[PDB]
Write a protein that binds this ligand. Sequence first.
Ligand SMILES: *C/C=C(\C)c1ccc(-c2ccc(OC)cc2)s1
Length: 133
Amino acid sequence: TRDQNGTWEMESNENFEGWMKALDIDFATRKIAVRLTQTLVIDQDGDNFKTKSTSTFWNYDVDFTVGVEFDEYTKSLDNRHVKALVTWEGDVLVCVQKGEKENRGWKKWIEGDKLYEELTCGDQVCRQVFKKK
Ligand SMILES: *C/C=C(\C)c1ccc(-c2ccc(OC)cc2)s1
């Protein structure tokens, strides 16, 4: 299934700090952020997505249309400019953010009843699992 709508509550997080470090996020922010449970809210209608990632320490939203490149400022995460593109590979939603960092982006897929995601930057992969609230 390609339908990723829902309020997704984190069950598992792995190597979130490695991903943040590859983005050069500073020590103090990483030390706090690595402790935190996350939520991911996805509003999906056709190609049109609204995605929110939140914890007690951040609340980041991004809107996009599958298949349409968008020039993006990454805002409070790392204040960088990238050319972002989200597409489907089978039932995997793949985002590539072209810019200074290599291998940068994320992937999301439904597996069983859960939402799995990968967060990538450089040689680092963060793996996460969420349950649908
Ligand atoms: C589809 C998944 C997305 C858009 C994200 C997963 C983690 C995100 C994130 C954004 C910003 C911060 O710090 C401000 C932390 C995590 S976004």
